[PDB]
Design a protein around this ligand. Structure first.
Ligand SMILES: *[C@@H]1O[C@H](CO)[C@@H](O)[C@H](O)[C@H]1NC(C)=O
Ligand code: NA
Lengths: 252, 36, 24
């Protein structure tokens, strides 16, 4: 996260770290949506142009973390994966449309003060909260600047949703309604963005109607990090929510 | 199961369940009120 | 379960999300 701050303990208890087994590397963020299911970006798991295609045995999911590096005895849980599910229409060639995947844990994770699922939006959440100028929150252990730049602890930044035409005009890539964009406009003081290794983490919003946190987006893509006139693009979770429910119904 | 976590989703034990706010969430709520 | 002693300053993997091939 660029221009963020240290997250407080327990502030994002659905945050998940995706960690490569061999060689050991921080890969991406993810989010806990139930005791057995984790949501992330498809490109964290599958990216043919770089010969990326992880199997379930290649990765760990680390839940409950704050420190990027210390094994957090007493708090963190490391879970193995039973199965990965990539959206079948994930479009890595053109624009990362449908950049979404689900991971099923081999065993359910015990909730705690540090481990707790985020809500998925319903129809009326999406209607009420996805409006230009409203801010959501992005968290992760990604790099602190476009590229060692690694943070000591989980970072957080709050970013406003941007108008659809401004998102479209900011890039020559064909963007779709399965994504939205967020970030500050140039010359307006505050800035900030997700960056490398924050992909797959959640863009969350707190409802003023019921005070729950809902995951509206997944960190998907951008042109570098925190560039003037560019925005971060996020997978629109509600638009893909039928697929999420279909996978969990069929496999949970 | 998925359904079992649903009832309490999105409410943090160290924040909403204790009626405490984190250090920057007021910025989010203020964007709904004064951000447009 | 996974033995945590198997783990600390691991690098962050280059992320295609911020360097996608569709821009090159
Ligand atoms: C990824 O690897 C698995 C295991 O070899 C294979 O079943 C699947 O076809 C591969 N997917 C792609 C897109 O290469
Ligand atoms: Na920007």
């Amino acid at each position: 996260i660029v221009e963020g701050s240290d997250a407080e303990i327990g502030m994002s208890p659905w945050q998940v770290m995706l960690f490569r087994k061999s060689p050991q590397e921080l890969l991406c963020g993810a989010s806990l949506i139930s005791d057995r299911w984790v949501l992330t970006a498809a490109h964290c798991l599958l990216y043919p142009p770089w010969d990326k295609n992880f199997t379930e045995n290649d990765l760990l999911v680390r839940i409950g973390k704050h420190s990027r590096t210390r094994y957090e005895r007493n708090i963190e849980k490391i879970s193995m994966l039973e199965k990965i599910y990539i959206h079948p229409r994930y479009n890595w060639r053109e624009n990362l449309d449908r950049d979404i995947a689900l991971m099923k844990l081999k065993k359910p994770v015990a909730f705690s003060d540090y481990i707790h699922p985020v809500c998925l939006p319903d129809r009326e959440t999406a209607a009420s909260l996805l409006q230009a100028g409203y801010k959501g929150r992005v968290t992760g252990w990604g790099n602190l600047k476009e590229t060692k730049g690694q943070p000591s602890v989980l970072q957080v930044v709050n970013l406003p949703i941007v108008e659809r035409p401004v998102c479209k005009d900011s890039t020559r890539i064909r963007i779709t309604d399965n994504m939205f964009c967020a970030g500050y406009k140039p010359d307006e003081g505050k800035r900030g963005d997700a960056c490398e290794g924050d992909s797959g983490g959640p863009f969350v919003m707190k409802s003023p109607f019921n005070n729950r946190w809902y995951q509206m987006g997944i960190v998907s893509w951008g042109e570098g990090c925190d560039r003037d006139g560019k925005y971060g693009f996020y997978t629109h979770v509600f638009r893909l929510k039928k697929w999420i429910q279909k996978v969990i119904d069929q496999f949970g | 199961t998925f359904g079992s976590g649903e009832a309490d989703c999105g409410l943090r034990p160290l924040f909403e369940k204790k009626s405490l706010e984190d250090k920057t969430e007021r910025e989010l709520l203020e964007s709904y009120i004064d951000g447009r | 379960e996974f033995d945590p002693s198997l783990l600390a300053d691991a690098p962050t993997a280059r992320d295609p999300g911020r360097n996608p091939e569709f821009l090159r």
